[PDB]
């Protein structure tokens, strides 16, 4: 997570600064050819996050998903990890779809640039780090956790099935925006998009009560 | 970002009104008041300023958006909002 | 029109992005297996 997650930020930061400090994912598109290295950097990072075999995230996440599955755990707890992993790929597609795979949407005057060696060297430095990453660490550290061996193949593929499954519909849902049909506001979208409703309530109700208690009561 | 200077603004400005098919290119003047001579309905005036908004990337407040009325005046309000003096 | 014209047109498809570099990646593959198969054969 130190390698590929750190990547996605200045990879995103590259598009932000180059495309005039704009952070709304609805203004990019077509950046694949505009910033080939930044686009190349992001796809490796996203694939690492999803847990593509033999590169970074596979050496940990694919082992973890297999590990928690291969244990006496809470059944409800195990289920959410699978849904999260599928959802982990889901937003990864959303970034690659809206930001890169599309058509330009930024202001007319284009200033896209990544030729600065500082940006190129910094990104490339972690790129070679993220490509191999887990191979070196797993092969180098002594074998100091117990490795489970006999997986019934149906659940050993779950580490890849759920993300590949999540890749499918998320792509289908994303390019459904390209479909001319209007998008009616679904109440679930009104819930998920608003940070899951947590900031609207917990940052307004408890703060108001304690503050009102301090002045109205307490002090006065 | 190179200094965006008022000559570039009006070049980009009249680029968009000429683009607007309701205002065909021939009679664009720098101070061509929209509905007075071009006949552009004020309901579309609250529409050409968002075209300006994405053109230069910033929000025009409504208090003056209804007042943003002429292409030269379009440029004029653009310059001071981004301290464009050159 | 500019967003749909010029070099900005004909953008690559979604799956087209992920397999970027496959043609060269497979090119590096075939020589790699050839090198190791010969090396294994010499052993």
């Amino acid at each position: 997570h130190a390698f590929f997650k750190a990547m996605l930020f200045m990879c995103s930061g590259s598009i932000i600064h180059s495309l005039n400090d704009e952070q709304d994912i609805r203004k990019m598109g077509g950046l694949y050819k505009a910033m080939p290295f930044t686009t190349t950097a992001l796809i490796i990072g996203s694939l690492a996050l999803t847990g593509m075999p033999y590169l970074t995230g596979f050496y940990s996440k694919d082992l973890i998903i297999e590990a928690v599955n291969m244990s006496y755990t809470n059944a409800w707890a195990l289920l959410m990890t699978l849904i999260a992993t599928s959802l982990t790929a889901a937003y990864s597609t959303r970034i690659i779809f809206f930001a890169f795979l599309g058509k330009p949407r930024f202001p007319p005057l284009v200033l896209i640039n990544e030729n600065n060696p500082l940006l190129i060297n910094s990104i490339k430095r972690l790129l070679i780090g993220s490509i191999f990453a887990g191979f070196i660490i797993s092969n180098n550290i002594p074998p100091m956790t117990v490795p489970n061996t006999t997986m019934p193949l149906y659940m050993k593929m779950t580490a890849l099935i759920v993300t590949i499954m999540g890749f499918m519909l998320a792509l289908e849902l994303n390019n459904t925006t390209y479909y001319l049909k209007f998008k009616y506001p679904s109440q679930t979208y009104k819930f998920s998009n608003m940070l899951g409703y947590y900031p609207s309530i917990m940052h307004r109700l408890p703060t108001y009560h304690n503050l009102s208690m301090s002045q109205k009561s307490a002090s006065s | 970002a190179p200094p965006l200077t008022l000559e570039a603004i009006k070049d980009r400005v009249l680029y968009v009104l000429k683009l607007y098919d309701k205002i065909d290119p021939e009679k664009l003047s720098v101070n061509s008041h929209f509905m007075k001579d071009l006949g552009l309905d004020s309901l579309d005036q609250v529409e050409i300023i968002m075209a300006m908004e994405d053109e230069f990337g910033f929000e025009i407040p409504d208090i003056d958006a209804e007042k943003l009325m002429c292409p030269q005046e379009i440029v004029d309000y653009i310059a001071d909002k981004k301290d464009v003096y050159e | 029109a500019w967003r749909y014209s010029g070099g900005f047109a004909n953008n690559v498809s979604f799956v087209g992005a992920l397999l970027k570099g496959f043609k060269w990646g497979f090119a590096a593959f075939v020589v790699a297996v050839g090198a190791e198969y010969y090396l294994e054969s010499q052993n």
């Binding site: 050819k33 505009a34 080939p36 007319p108 005057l109 284009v110 200033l111 896209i112 640039n113 030729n115 | 970002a1 190179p2 200094p3 980009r12 | 500019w2 010029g6 070099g7 900005f8």
Partner: peptide
């Protein structure tokens, strides 16, 4: 932003790239 940048911007066009 002085004159002489190798990524000279464009208006409504595909930005120039470099082989590197």
């Amino acid at each position: 932003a002085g004159g002489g940048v190798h990524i000279e911007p464009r208006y409504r066009q595909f930005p120039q790239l470099t082989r590197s």
